[PDB]
Structures are given as C-alpha cells and as structure tokens.
Amino acid sequence: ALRQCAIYGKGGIGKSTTTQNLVAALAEAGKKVMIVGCDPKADSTRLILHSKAQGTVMEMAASAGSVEDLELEDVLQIGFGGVKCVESGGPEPGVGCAGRGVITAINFLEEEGAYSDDLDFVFYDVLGDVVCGGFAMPIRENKAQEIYIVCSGEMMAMYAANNIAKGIVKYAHSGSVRLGGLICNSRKTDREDELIMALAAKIGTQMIHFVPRDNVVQHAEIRRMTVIEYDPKAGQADEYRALARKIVDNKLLVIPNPASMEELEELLMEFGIMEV
Amino acid sequence: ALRQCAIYGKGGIGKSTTTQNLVAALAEAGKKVMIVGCDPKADSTRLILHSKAQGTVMEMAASAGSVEDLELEDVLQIGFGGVKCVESGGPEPGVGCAGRGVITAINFLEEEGAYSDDLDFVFYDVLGDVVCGGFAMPIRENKAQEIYIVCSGEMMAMYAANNIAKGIVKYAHSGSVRLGGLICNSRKTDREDELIMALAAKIGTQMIHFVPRDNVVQHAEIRMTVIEYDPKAGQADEYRALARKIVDNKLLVIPNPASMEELEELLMEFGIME
Numbered sequence: 250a251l252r253q254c255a256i257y258g259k260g261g262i263g264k265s266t267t268t269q270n271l272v273a274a275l276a277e278a279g280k281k282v283m284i285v286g287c288d289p290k291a292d293s294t295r296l297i298l299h300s301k302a303q304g305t306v307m308e309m310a311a312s313a314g315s316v317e318d319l320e321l322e323d324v325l326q327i328g329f330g331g332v333k334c335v336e337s338g339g340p341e342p343g344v345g346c347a348g349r350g351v352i353t354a355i356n357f358l359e360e361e362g363a364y365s366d367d368l369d370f371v372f373y374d375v376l377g378d379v380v381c382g383g384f385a386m387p388i389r390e391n392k393a394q395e396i397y398i399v400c401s402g403e404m405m406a407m408y409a410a411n412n413i414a415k416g417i418v419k420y421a422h423s424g425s426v427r428l429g430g431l432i433c434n435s436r437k438t439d440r441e442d443e444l445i446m447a448l449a450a451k452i453g454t455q456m457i458h459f460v461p462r463d464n465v466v467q468h469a470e471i472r473r474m475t476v477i478e479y480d481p482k483a484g485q486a487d488e489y490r491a492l493a494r495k496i497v498d499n500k501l502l503v504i505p506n507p508a509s510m511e512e513l514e515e516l517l518m519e520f521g522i523m524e525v
Numbered sequence: 526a527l528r529q530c531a532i533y534g535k536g537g538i539g540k541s542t543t544t545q546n547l548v549a550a551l552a553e554a555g556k557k558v559m560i561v562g563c564d565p566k567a568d569s570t571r572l573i574l575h576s577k578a579q580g581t582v583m584e585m586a587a588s589a590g591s592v593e594d595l596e597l598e599d600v601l602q603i604g605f606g607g608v609k610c611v612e613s614g615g616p617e618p619g620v621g622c623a624g625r626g627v628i629t630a631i632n633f634l635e636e637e638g639a640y641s642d643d644l645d646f647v648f649y650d651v652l653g654d655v656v657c658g659g660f661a662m663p664i665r666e667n668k669a670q671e672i673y674i675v676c677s678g679e680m681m682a683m684y685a686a687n688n689i690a691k692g693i694v695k696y697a698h699s700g701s702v703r704l705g706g707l708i709c710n711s712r713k714t715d716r717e718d719e720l721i722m723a724l725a726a727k728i729g730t731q732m733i734h735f736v737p738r739d740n741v742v743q744h745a746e747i748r749m750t751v752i753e754y755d756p757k758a759g760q761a762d763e764y765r766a767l768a769r770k771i772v773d774n775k776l777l778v779i780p781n782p783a784s785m786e787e788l789e790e791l792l793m794e795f796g797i798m799e
C-alpha cells in the first residue's frame with residue numbers, strides 16, 4: 250500500500266510549493282505522508298512545519314560528528330496534518346558532491362525504519378537541473394517508483410523534464426521506476442497547457458494537471474504555510490486537491506520515449522514560443 | 526599577462542548569450558581570448574562559431590575511446606574575431622557526474638598547451654545551479670582567478686549567485702580565485718537593477734553591468750551573436766560597455782555571502798506583486 254513518489258524539475262519551477270500543497274491535500278483527506286527534501290536549498294518542508302528552514306540530516310550529522318549517532322527525532326519533524334518532514338541537506342558549496350546528503354538521508358531513514366507501516370505516501374522533492382549523484386539516486390537505486398516532473402512552457406523547464414525522462418529510461422531494467430506524468434506549473438503563457446500536453450504525448454506520458462499561477466500562493470508562503478492551511482476555501486486549494494486526487498488515482502506509469510533537442514525546439518516553434 | 530576568468534549563474538539566466546558577446550567586444554578591441562563552455566547544455570560557443578552545436582570534448586573523447594587519442598584540432602575551433610572555442614560537454618542524464626566534461630576538457634587543454642603565449646584572456650562559461658565536481662573545479666583547482674555572475678531579480682538566480690560566492694570563500698586560502706562582480710540580465714522587472722546593486726553591496730562586490738532584455742538577441746540567435754548580426758544596435762554597445770568594464774576591473778574580492786533570511790529581506794524590499 251505504501252507508494253514512493255519523487256517530484257523532479259528545474260530550479261524555481263514550483264516543486265516545493267506543488268509538493269507541500271498536494272501533500273497537505275493528501276493529509277487533509279486522511280492520508281499518512283512523509284516529505285523527504287532532496288534539494289540543497291533545504292526549504293522543501295518549511296510550509297508544512299511553519300519554520301524558517303528545517304535542520305538537515307547533513308547539519309545534524311556534522312553537529313553530532315557522525316550519521317551513526319543520530320536517531321529519528323534529530324531529523325524527523327511532524328507538521329500540518331501529521332505530515333512527517335525530513336530535509337537531506339547537502340555539503341557546503343564548492344565541497345564534495347551536492348547530492349551526497351540525499352544518499353546519506355535516504356540510507357539513514359531506511360536503517361532507522363522511518364518508512365513506518367501506517368505511511369501511505371513518501372514524496373522526495375528533488376533538484377532536477379542535473380540528474381547525477383544523489384539527485385539520480387531515487388531513480389537509479391529504485392527508491393521512488395512514481396516520478397512526476399514539474400515543468401512549464403519554457404525551453405529550460407522542458408529540457409530538464411526530458412533529461413529526467415532519459416534517466417528513467419536508463420534504469421527501467423534495474424527496477425520499477427516509472428514516469429507518472431508532467432505537472433504544468435503555469436507561467437501565464439498562451440497555449441502553455443497545449444504545449445505541455447503535446448510534450449507529454451511526444452514522450453509517451455500525460456500532463457496529469459495544470460497548476461495555475463495564483464497570488465494566494467505568495468500570501469500563504471509569506472506566513473510559512475500551504476494554501477490548504479492558509480485558505481482552504483481558495484480556488485487554488487481545490488487545484489492542489491485535484492492534483493493530489495489524480496496522483497492517488499493515477500494508473501499510467503510508463504518508460505518514456507525522450508525527445509531529441511530538435512523535437513523540443515519543433516514543439517516550442519509550433520506553439521509560438523520559438524522562431525524558425 | 527594571461528588573465529583567466531569564469532562566468533557563473535543558474536540555468537536559462539543568459540550565461541551563454543552574455544559571454545559570446547562580451548568576448549566578441551574583447552576580440553574587436555584586439556584581445557586574444559578563448560571560451561571554454563562548462564555547461565552540459567553545450568550551446569555556449571554556438572553563436573561565435575555560427576554552428577547549431579560544437580562537437581564537445583566528451584563526444585570526441587567517447588568517439589575516440591580515450592582522451593589520449595583525442596586531438597586539439599577536433600575540439601578547438603576559431604570563430605568571430607579569432608576567438609578560440611572549446612565545449613566541454615557532459616555525460617548522459619542520470620549517469621556519472623554532470624561536471625565530468627569540465628575536468629576532462631580543462632586537463633586536456635592544459636596538456637595540449639591550448640593556453641598559448643599570445644592568449645590574453647580565457648573565459649569559462651560554468652553551470653551554476655550546483656557548485657561541485659567539475660563545475661567547482663575552476664574555483665577549487667585555481668583555474669580561473671576572476672569570477673563573474675549573471676543573475677536577475679528572481680530568488681533562485683540570487684540564491685545561485687550567493688552559493689558561487691560561498692564556493693569562492695571556501696577556496697580563498699588555497700589559491701588566487703576571487704569574485705569580480707555581478708551581471709544583471711534583465712527580466713523586464715521594476716527595481717531589478719536596484720535589487721542586484723543591493724545584493725552586490727550586501728556580499729561585498731559590485732553590479733558591474735545591467736544587461737537589458739532586447740528582441741535583437743532573438744533576431745541574431747535565429748545562429749549568430751549581436752555584434753556579428755547588428756554591430757550598430759543599442760544592445761551591441763551594452764556588451765561593449767561590459768567588456769571595457771571587465772578589463773578595467775581590479776575589484777576582485779573574497780565575498781561575504783548573505784544568509785537565506787538576508788536574500789528574502791532584499792527581495793521583499795524591491796520585488797513587486799505579479
């Protein structure tokens with residue numbers, strides 16, 4: 250019954266906002282969820298916890314002088330709707346591999362039995378600008394069976410989405426990691442929904458949901474909360490509830506067929522975003 | 526006499542568009558300069574060479590089966606104003622280290638003595654979303670002495686800029702790597718220039734130049750630089766102004782990175798409601 254998911258996409262695309270909000274809607278519906286932050290920015294749990302930034306696995310390990318000396322209560326926190334929160338963290342910029350905290354955190358959580366019997370979902374919020382090291386680990390090491398990619402009608406967001414799809418293809422034989430769909434997080438661009446639906450069709454997936462751009466998100470976040478908590482009656486709260494419901498009901502889990510750079514350019518040219 | 530510089534920033538911020546134009550202005554002023562593309566997107570030399578994509582060091586090494594069997598001739602290309610072009614490349618997504626092409630490329634260029642006697646400048650165009658592996662090598666291994674950052678008024682662009690600064694601090698005692706300044710690449714946001722000038726002041730650097738958002742860039746790219754397409758355009762003078770400012774630069778500091786709270790404080794002060 251436990252379903253392990255990962256939310257990938259380029260930086261600033263809306264992974265943390267989307268994940269925390271959809272998870273808050275899952276908790277609201279009685280689902281037991283854990284969010285594991287896998288982005289060195291380390292603010293993937295702040296809307297669930299109402300914190301400035303949660304102490305990461307790496308910070309606690311460095312403070313303690315060992316990962317082995319740590320216990321679950323050093324790294325795991327319960328927030329809104331009983332959602333469990335862990336933040337991997339990463340080394341300081343310029344030092345080691347930026348994704349090494351992801352490997353450390355996931356192995357620690359497994360060893361400590363953080364993946365309890367009552368848990369219905371686990372969501373990894375993963376940096377997607379590069380798909381290597383610890384960032385590729387949820388895919389490569391079969392940790393997240395359902396991948397959802399947050400993207401937009403921008404080339405860099407589509408390129409990043411297509412690269413994550415390549416990673417899934419590479420490890421398709423190794424486990425049961427599959428692409429569940431694309432989540433279009435609106436940038437208020439004309440034909441954006443059509444472009445992402447076409448990109449989804451081209452690579453053998455679906456655009457599971459279109460998330461509109463809404464200022465209520467900024468209003469909730471400035472108060473360190475999800476829209477679900479800040480204004481449960483807001484239109485945007487229903488958008489996150491619909492996304493959460495569609496992920497729960499999703500049965501389309503595929504080995505994608507990534508597009509070439511020429512094909513990505515062809516799509517953007519067709520939907521007006523690019524010149525010939 | 527050779528000065529080695531590096532241009533950092535988040536993906537899609539404009540790194541490749543800025544670099545190929547400031548270097549073009551250096552070449553037209555008689556400077557001998559080489560661009561080493563350190564981004565897996567591998568379209569960092571695309572415009573100066575007037576190509577769709579230059580054959581990367583990784584592709585050529587993979588094609589040859591070894592770096593030892595690789596030649597300088599089929600990795601280095603001369604484009605506009607005699608500018609030398611090298612594209613590092615990277616492995617396939619999900620595989621190895623995304624920055625591996627950078628280590629391979631820089632070590633190959635050194636061994637082949639691509640850093641010739643006549644060369645005045647070397648500009649590394651580095652991916653800045655992560656500061657590790659090959660992307661941190663020009664800083665960590667003292668390859669580029671002058672660092673510069675293309676950013677915008679967006680949180681993720683400023684956050685990226687601040688981490689590059691942290692990387693410079695970490696290796697300040699290991700070599701002579703320093704921060705030269707910030708380059709604001711306009712997203713047509715009100716008070717965006719003030720925000721980047723403030724971020725620069727906060728971390729002990731300068732906003733060396735403000736690059737406006739211009740459609741002439743798209744007109745040139747549809748596959749050459751602005752200085753090649755329309756040297757008389759207003760935008761061509763913008764990059765010329767930047768080039769003058771990097772040679773005339775001596776403000777190369779050990780930065781004082783801001784906290785996340787300080788980055789938020791800056792955005793809250795200048796940033797405007799959508």
Ligand SMILES: Nc1ncnc2c1ncn2[C@@H]1O[C@H](COP(=O)(O)OP(=O)(O)O)[C@@H](O)[C@H]1O
Pocket residue numbers: 258259260261262263264265266267434435460461462463464466467470681
């Ligand atoms: N649907 C949305 N409507 C409005 N603002 C949004 C929406 N989704 C994300 N944002 C905003 O976009 C910015 C970046 O989002 P974030 O979730 O932190 O991205 P990521 O985790 O992918 O780096 C934040 O300022 C956030 O408030």
Ligand SMILES: Nc1ncnc2c1ncn2[C@@H]1O[C@H](COP(=O)(O)OP(=O)(O)O)[C@@H](O)[C@H]1O
Pocket residue numbers: 534535536537538539540541542543566710711736737738739740742743746
């Ligand atoms: N000053 C500018 N004016 C207009 N378009 C620009 C400007 N700078 C960059 N661009 C555009 O922004 C996009 C991304 O820029 P690029 O240099 O490829 O980014 P990066 O190398 O940082 O990923 C391209 O479509 C490019 O044409």
Ligand code: SF4
Pocket residue numbers: 345346347348349379380381382383621622623624625655656657658659
């Ligand atoms: S594998 Fe990825 S995250 Fe790790 S050092 Fe290389 S580029 Fe950085």
Ligand SMILES: [Mg+2]
Pocket residue numbers: 264265266288290292293374
């Ligand atoms: Mg995030």
Ligand SMILES: [Mg+2]
Pocket residue numbers: 540541564566567568569
């Ligand atoms: Mg580039």
